[PDB]
RNA sequence: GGUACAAUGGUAUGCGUAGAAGUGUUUGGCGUAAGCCUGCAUGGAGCUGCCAUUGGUACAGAUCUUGGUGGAUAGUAGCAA
RNA sequence: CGGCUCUUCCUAUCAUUGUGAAGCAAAAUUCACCAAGCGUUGGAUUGUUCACCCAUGCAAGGGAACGUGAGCUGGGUUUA
RNA sequence: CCCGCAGGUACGGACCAAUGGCACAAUACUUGUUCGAGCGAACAGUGGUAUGACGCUACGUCCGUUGGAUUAUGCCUGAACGCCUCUAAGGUCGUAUCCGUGCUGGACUGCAAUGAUAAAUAAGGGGCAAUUUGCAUUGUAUGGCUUCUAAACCAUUUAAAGUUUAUAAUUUACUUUAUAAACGACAAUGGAUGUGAUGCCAAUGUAAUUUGUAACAUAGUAAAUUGGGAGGAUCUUCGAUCACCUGAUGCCGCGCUAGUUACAUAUAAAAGCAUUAUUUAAUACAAUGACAAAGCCUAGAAUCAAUUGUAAACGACUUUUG
């Protein structure tokens, strides 16, 4: 069952040549909810998603627009929903059909994600820098980056574990067990701006960003919604990792602690980076010739453009 | 076919593998060139001609030679081409209608009068 | 609809030894047959379980060194082991063999009109006409819960649906011929084309 | 014993620019078989059956000999001091 | 021939898991059973290959494709 | 010791915030030359030294699992073998093993759900066809017409098990129990119980043109249409899934069996008396097909080229283009 609605960055996904397009998707089954929309189809479909079905999930879409990437064609997943009473998981489904999720209403914080992506593309390498050979001797013919044994003389064949040059990375990961430090909150503007305060912490009490200073490098510019994750996921530059609950139990005291931050750095990453907010460039550094001149060229001209009026 | 390298513009011909030969290309120009010109003096309108018949024939070698090691001396050699086009005018085709023959006999509606003729129509 | 004596045989697997019900139906297929298995979670193996346990995990063990993607493919399901010991009875490497295959249906568990089509048995495999009293047996469906099949009960669940769609088909069926019986005593002065004439069967037909 | 090739002596009141030798071929054949006869197509001036007597007389091989050709390969060979 | 590299296999089990037994109090060890999953190293001398030596190590098992020279090396062996 | 805790080794899979390594041949200085001198000049295949973002990278960082049958063994219950006994049935504890989970690939090209559904608007594509036609061929059907069994035996249990029905007790359920009969692996049943009680036939024409026309006792049957509930989805022969089915609206009010008994009418003889011959199809039922044949509906995408750089030997890939 989709839905009456769909947004339009979030219906490019089944368009390969969407500029071109007359965007004729979902022109039609959109109308099987202004038809008798219970006979049409709708309606006995959520009854045979109810008598029939054990496993109950949803097609979700991200909002790409709002991360200023060049993607602008969202991603859409389908996400299992994972409650008692089968009837329970349609009656979810059919009420939040086009409203919007938050990561604060599925993730909490000292929570186990486990991450799952591609990893960073390598390219084709050798068998040193992939399969992790010793090299060679210095003083060897023909290559000291190989191997020097593909295998026996027999099985007569060269087989399949015995390591070999081809492609490195851009691999499927599922890596496990990364904690989430902080469930950020984003995007704006309560009374006034607030977009401050996800790094301000309870020792800190300094209200930065969480963006550091000139962006994240690469991939930069967090203004929305987030998940602190200790040390590394997968992938690279802007790439969508897909987050997700623990398939484990956790009895390890190292995994069930309860954490608080006091600290983080919002450092420049281009860089050796000295400064956390842009302020203390200016506490610790003065007025460059910079700010000291553009302050003292408008205030100036103020008064000195209608030197030639007067 | 081999090792050509595999390009984009192929999935078009669904193939891989294809390239683009500049000079094989120039040499079909100046041949079509001919036969367009000759279409001219026969009193054809070029815009309806099609390529009805093209073909390639490899004709007789050249001889030079590389320079080996060790003092030997191997062929290098030059293999040409013969090309031959006709291009023929496509109008609304009427294709073709083979010819009928009698085998007749005059024995033929008495062991079908039972069978086919005063037997009713059905359905 | 049709087929070269009947529409297929749908044999029910369910107390049939493997082997000698998969050299009936090989040879059978082979003379122009299309059957059908159903059942083949409930096939038998003679001899006690671990026995043959332990001849499933020495197949388990043939693998081509040089690729393992080559290799023997071991299906585990109860339907794709009886398709094994089939496959071996045929000759697959000819088109008469392998036309022969493409007659055969196996499946564990009995859906998709085999639920409601015709089961006819084969009395020469059936277990309980063969082996002894004191002889041990095991089933396909057992085999292949403990070698890496994952429906035995996927396929227990949809069976006892299969068996309780089963139970009103039975029950109108029941009562729908208690007025066939009934009819047969409005009917009785029929002409007298019963009364007589079907004493050539003729005491209880 | 039989069959292919080339000749010489006889022989067939043999064949042939109204198409010989050769070649090509889903023309039809004959022979256990080597091979043979035949139609059509190309070809353009010579050739065949029989008796004898012959001989530089029959090829798949010889890392055979001479010549021509195919893959590899239109190229991850290569044309980078 | 060896070494280097690299992969797989055996069990005739060194260690570890699960055990049975001791002339098994504990500790340490010994004998045996199921068992080949993980592991089985750094050097000095010699071209070695075993054995020996320093040392680390909870603990330092034995072998297969004479494995492996268009993989290398070229020390042994082996042309002038 | 068990157990709990905290770390490390080796290996694995990632990653770059920090730290370490490589150099924007970015920038500073500097040697030699050269530009008349003077510069964020040059040359010395990177002149040399120094610091050195991005990126790559370890010498850094983060992460590294879970159930089942069960081997060895210890037992339980328990005999043959009056006792005893881990074994003979039957229970059980249970390994770094084994097999799975989690993880990585995916039959190249397997399968399922789903989205849109053209060069339109003159004119023609595309469905929905199955109704639409003659036409022509297909398959079954072979001289009606040498057929269906898509209606059935229950699930798990079992070689003294394993069965029925009946009745009195009882179910959430032919629930479970108590008496009494029945073939107590007969021939039976291996085919027809034709397992919603089958048909090569109703039509009283049963078939290579054929059709059927009235009275007396039985019998009451299949029949086409528009707005509610309960039901049906196991790697598919048509899912805007839907066939008994709420109360409504009107008809063809049509066709009907079986039996006794009566009458008309019509087709039918293939030439052969060693009637076997091409061994066939006018039959009927399902299916395509093309040439002129009536309407209902419909109004897209992909690839290339350019672009990106999460990618890259080339393809491919992630992207973007009023």
Same mark, same amino acid.
């Given at each position: 069952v989709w839905a009456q609605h769909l947004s339009e960055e979030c219906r490019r996904r089944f368009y390969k040549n969407w500029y071109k397009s007359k965007k004729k998707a979902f022109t039609k089954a959109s109308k099987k909810w202004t038809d008798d929309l219970g006979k049409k189809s709708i309606e006995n479909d959520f009854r045979k998603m109810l008598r029939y079905c054990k496993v109950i999930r949803v097609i979700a879409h991200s909002q790409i627009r709002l991360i200023k990437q060049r993607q602008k064609k969202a991603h859409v997943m389908e996400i299992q929903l994972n409650g008692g009473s089968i009837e329970d998981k349609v009656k979810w489904a059919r009420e939040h059909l086009e409203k919007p999720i938050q990561v604060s209403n599925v993730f909490g914080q000292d929570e186990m994600i486990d991450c799952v992506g591609v990893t960073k593309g390598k390219g084709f390498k050798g068998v040193t820098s992939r399969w992790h050979t010793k090299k060679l001797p210095r003083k060897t013919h023909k290559g000291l980056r190989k191997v020097a044994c593909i295998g026996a003389w027999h099985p007569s064949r060269?087989?399949?574990?015995?390591?070999?040059?081809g492609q490195k990375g851009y691999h499927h990961r599922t890596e496990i067990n990364k904690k989430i430090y902080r469930i950020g909150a984003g995007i704006h503007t309560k009374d006034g701006k607030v977009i401050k305060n996800n790094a301000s912490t309870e020792y800190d009490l300094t209200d930065k960003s969480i963006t550091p200073m000139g962006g994240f490098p690469h991939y930069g510019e967090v203004n929305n919604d987030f998940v602190m994750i200790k040390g590394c996921c997968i992938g690279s530059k802007k790439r969508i990792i897909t987050l997700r609950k623990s398939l484990l139990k956790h009895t390890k005291r190292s995994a069930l602690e309860q954490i608080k931050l006091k600290f983080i750095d919002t450092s420049s990453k281009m860089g050796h980076g000295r400064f956390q907010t842009p302020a203390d460039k200016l506490a610790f550094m003065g007025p460059l010739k910079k700010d000291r001149l553009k302050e003292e060229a408008a205030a100036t001209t103020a008064a000195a453009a209608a030197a030639t009026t007067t | 076919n081999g090792g050509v390298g595999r390009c984009a513009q192929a999935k078009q011909w669904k193939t891989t593998?294809?390239?683009?030969?500049?000079?094989?290309?120039?040499?079909?120009?100046?041949?079509?060139?001919?036969?367009?010109?000759?279409?001219?003096?026969?009193?054809?309108?070029?815009?309806?001609?099609?390529?009805?018949?093209?073909?390639?024939?490899?004709?007789?070698?050249?001889r030079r030679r590389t320079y080996r090691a060790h003092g030997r001396i191997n062929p290098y050699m030059s293999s040409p081409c013969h090309v031959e086009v006709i291009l023929t005018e496509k109008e609304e085709l009427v294709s073709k209608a083979t010819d009928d023959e009698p085998a007749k006999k005059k024995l033929s509606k008495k062991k079908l009068q039972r069978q086919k003729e005063k037997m009713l129509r059905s359905e | 609809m049709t087929g070269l004596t009947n529409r297929t045989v749908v044999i029910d697997g369910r107390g049939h030894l493997l082997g000698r019900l998969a050299s009936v139906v090989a040879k059978y297929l082979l003379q122009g047959g299309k059957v059908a298995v159903v059942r083949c979670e409930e096939l038998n193996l003679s001899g006690h379980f671990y026995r043959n346990k332990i001849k499933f995990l020495a197949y388990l063990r043939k693998r081509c060194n040089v690729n393992p993607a080559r290799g023997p493919f071991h299906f585990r399901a109860p339907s794709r082991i009886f398709y094994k010991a089939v496959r071996g009875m045929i000759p697959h490497k000819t088109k008469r063999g392998q036309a022969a295959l493409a007659r055969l249906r196996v499946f564990d568990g009995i859906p998709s009109p085999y639920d409601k089509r015709r089961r006819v /048995?084969?009395?020469?495999?059936?277990? $309980?006409?063969?082996?002894?009293?004191?002889?041990?047996?095991?089933? /396909?469906?057992?085999?292949?819960?403990? $070698?890496?099949?994952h429906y035995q009960d996927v396929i227990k669940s949809l069976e006892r649906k299969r068996k309780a769609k089963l139970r009103v088909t039975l029950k109108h069926n029941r009562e729908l011929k208690k007025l066939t019986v009934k009819a047969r005593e409005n009917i009785a002065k029929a002409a007298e084309p019963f009364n007589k004439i079907i004493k050539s069967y003729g005491y209880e037909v």
């Open positions: 060269v087989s399949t574990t015995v390591a070999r040059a | 593998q294809g390239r683009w030969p500049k000079k094989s290309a120039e040499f079909l120009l100046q041949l079509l060139r001919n036969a367009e010109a000759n279409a001219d003096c026969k009193g054809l309108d070029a815009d309806r001609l099609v390529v009805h018949h093209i073909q390639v024939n490899r004709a007789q070698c050249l | /048995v084969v009395p020469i495999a059936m277990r $309980v006409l063969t082996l002894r009293s004191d002889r041990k047996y095991c089933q /396909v469906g057992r085999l292949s819960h403990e $070698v890496g099949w």
